[PDB]
Design a protein around this ligand. Structure first.
Ligand SMILES: [Ca+2]
Ligand SMILES: [Ca+2]
Ligand SMILES: [Ca+2]
Ligand SMILES: [Ca+2]
Ligand SMILES: [Ca+2]
Ligand SMILES: [Ca+2]
Lengths: 297, 299
């Protein structure tokens, strides 16, 4: 099912970027936000799919996983989903998903069939996987806040079986799921370029982006990394240079590897997540019924 | 089949009380105040009272579910991951019948909780996107076929219609086939008068936005005429009571008209109302609108 015909993007109705740092000013130039789709209900988890040169993201509430093609076309990749939220792409260019409904991590084939990868920790059902990433070694890392258990429009209500909201690492060899850290409503996550630092946001309690040291098979030196001026640092991404681009109530905030705020990119509505394409020349941002994109020069 | 709302008392709705000018309607309502039975959907539609299960069945069109309100306040998912089910109705055998934007057809559910196809084409071409339906005393299913489900991603799958008309159809209980009874402009809600001599059908285009009345005599609809216009918004879905009054949804709540088309009063609702229906005894009025399912308990 094609939900948007091929066609050019239309400028988004919002104020141009507010840039402080000269380095970010050079990166964005006079780029202006564009609207790629605006017919969803609750856009989430954008992930660039190089193998298909498609931007994958889901409409959590509409229970679909959509795919934006470079010609502007938007197709339905997965329909009538079990409330899929976050999306990611593995080393084999396969799509992996966080599903609120099945409360698990799944992986789709070519037929568009999402197969279960894990739905329990130590024999107890996960809360409701929210966002995920795939490390270079193939392990899938993800957050498990209880959001999918407290809102009917986003899953099936239920009292949690687990007494913790954790960040987990699913080994690529089939070994047991690993509880890496307990947080307060962990949400988005992303590794630093060298994977020595893992960033995870918490959106209950302190609303922030937390940093962890990834070394010797565990997470260490937990500390506050950054806070966004408005709203929640929901989903976010880190570019090859080390900058963290995070969603927020008013748009996307950009921070350097030291946590310094460099600038803000307004969006017409609350932003839920964001990611870059392969070349990192296009910044995709999800939020409400929309998929926005900022073309960098 | 999960439970989306635990059992528990309803909460009064945050809206103004009924504005009643008619004395007869003031008596019918008494001091009744609107209640909220559910507020966690996205686009509530097609409420239908299911006597056999003493449950109010309705759809969350955008959320792709058909929900069921139990009298203790519990709300369960009756049909999940639907093909954008909109209108719901109950046939003589107490089976649920549905209008599905996605499958562009009329379907019927079994005790298995599975909706099976009844009809999805006219003259070999796919229907536009069945919106609302009713079941006549003779078992025939009547429904409206506007193209809403073909021009909004959040409510179906976009496509160019195969039919060059938006019709009201009649599906015979014996041997079909579908009967094209009338063509309208975005036909939406529909309901029969108690004696079934008049069929009311609303038209809600982007040419008139109104509730239209037809004469149902012989084997066709005759004498098309304007019946009423609601003060605000669209007369989406509506129902008719045993006395002949037509209770219709609108942008500000439910409007009540007598059989002569005279406005009797207005029942404010906190948000736009999409449809409404009564329970078996017609002692409780259920109203759908956005994330909500509201109810007005009559004395
Ligand atoms: Ca589910
Ligand atoms: Ca998230
Ligand atoms: Ca990501
Ligand atoms: Ca579809
Ligand atoms: Ca309708
Ligand atoms: Ca009805």
């Amino acid at each position: 099912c094609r939900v948007r015909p091929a066609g050019p993007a239309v400028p988004a109705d919002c104020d141009p970027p507010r840039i402080t740092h000269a380095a970010l000013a050079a990166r964005l130039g006079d780029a202006r936000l564009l609207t790629l789709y605006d017919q969803a209900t609750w856009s989430e988890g954008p992930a660039w799919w190089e193998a298909q040169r498609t931007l994958v993201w889901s409409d959590l509430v509409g229970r679909r996983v959509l795919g934006w093609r470079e010609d502007g076309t938007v197709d339905v990749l997965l329909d009538a989903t079990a409330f899929t939220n976050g999306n990611a792409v593995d080393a084999q260019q396969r799509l992996v998903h966080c599903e609120h409904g099945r409360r698990a991590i799944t992986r789709s084939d070519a037929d568009g069939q999402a197969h279960l990868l894990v739905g329990r920790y130590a024999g107890k059902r996960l809360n409701s996987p929210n966002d995920l990433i795939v490390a270079r070694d193939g392990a899938i890392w993800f957050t498990d806040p209880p959001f999918g258990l407290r809102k009917p429009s986003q899953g099936c209500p239920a009292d949690p079986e687990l007494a913790h909201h954790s960040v987990y690492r699913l080994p690529p060899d089939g070994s047991p799921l690993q509880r890496m850290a307990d947080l307060d409503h962990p949400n988005g996550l992303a590794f630093s370029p060298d994977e020595q630092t893992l960033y995870v946001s918490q959106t209950p309690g302190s609303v922030e982006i937390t940093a962890f040291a990834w070394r010797d098979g565990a997470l260490h030196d937990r500390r506050h990394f950054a806070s966004v001026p408005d709203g929640l640092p929901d989903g976010f991404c880190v570019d090859r240079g080390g900058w963290l681009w995070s969603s927020s109530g008013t748009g996307v905030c950009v921070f350097d590897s030291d946590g310094q705020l460099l600038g803000h990119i307004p969006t017409p509505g609350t932003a839920s997540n964001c990611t870059f394409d392969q070349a990192q020349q296009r910044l995709f941002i999800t939020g409400g019924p929309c998929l926005w994109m900022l073309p960098l020069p």
